Amino acid sequence: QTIQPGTGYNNGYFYSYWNDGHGGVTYTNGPGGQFSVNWSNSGNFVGGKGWQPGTKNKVINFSGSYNPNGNSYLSVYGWSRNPLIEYYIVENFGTYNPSTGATKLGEVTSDGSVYDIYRTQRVNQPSIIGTATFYQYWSVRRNHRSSGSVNTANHFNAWAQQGLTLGTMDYQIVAVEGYFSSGSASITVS
Ligand SMILES: [Zn+2]
Ligand SMILES: [Zn+2]
Ligand SMILES: [Zn+2]
Ligand SMILES: [Zn+2]
Ligand SMILES: [Zn+2]
């Protein structure tokens, strides 16, 4: 169904849909591992399906249509606690590379592309534990795509080599994120 912000289980998959209160976004859970998002003049939002809790060796399959018009990402996305970390394995993005201005720490080759690795920080921003300061870990795929498989272990292991430690995994989803833009997407996870 189309839903308001929240989390839960739908047709065998965890989902998380969050937004900053700005209008312009419609997030809809579909059959099985499918979800869709349609947005126009949105604020910041993040929505998708996966698992709760996530694991450090899952191979995640995603497919569908991803048509952003502006700033948006399509990523394997999740959190850990102890330490609190928001992480992204970005498979595709729109007009803005999320690593812009960030210091590159490394690279990893996985599932048909090299990815560049970065660490950034958010100060007193929304998080799974409420407003908080936390680091973000990024692997950014060089060869953009909208279907395929992500061997998360390759990324988590590469990050660990850079001192980017993950604690206990909270949720782990394939998420469509938008930042004051427009677009449409229909993604299926497994
Ligand atoms: Zn393009
Ligand atoms: Zn592209
Ligand atoms: Zn392309
Ligand atoms: Zn391109
Ligand atoms: Zn292109």
PDB file of N, CA and C and ligand atoms in Angstrom, residues 92-94 144-145, ligand 2:
ATOM      1  N   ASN A  92      23.666   3.459  -8.096  1.00  0.00           N
ATOM      2  CA  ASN A  92      23.280   4.419  -9.117  1.00  0.00           C
ATOM      3  C   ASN A  92      22.915   5.721  -8.406  1.00  0.00           C
ATOM      4  N   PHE A  93      23.032   6.840  -9.112  1.00  0.00           N
ATOM      5  CA  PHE A  93      22.647   8.125  -8.552  1.00  0.00           C
ATOM      6  C   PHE A  93      22.305   9.094  -9.665  1.00  0.00           C
ATOM      7  N   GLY A  94      21.686  10.205  -9.287  1.00  0.00           N
ATOM      8  CA  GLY A  94      21.298  11.205 -10.258  1.00  0.00           C
ATOM      9  C   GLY A  94      22.347  12.255 -10.538  1.00  0.00           C
ATOM     10  N   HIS A 144      27.364   2.746 -13.023  1.00  0.00           N
ATOM     11  CA  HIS A 144      25.970   2.809 -12.595  1.00  0.00           C
ATOM     12  C   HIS A 144      25.096   1.727 -13.203  1.00  0.00           C
ATOM     13  N   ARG A 145      24.175   1.207 -12.400  1.00  0.00           N
ATOM     14  CA  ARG A 145      23.240   0.192 -12.871  1.00  0.00           C
ATOM     15  C   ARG A 145      21.991   0.180 -11.998  1.00  0.00           C
TER      16      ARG A 145
HETATM   17 ZN    ZN B   2      24.797   7.117 -14.484  1.00  0.00          ZN
END
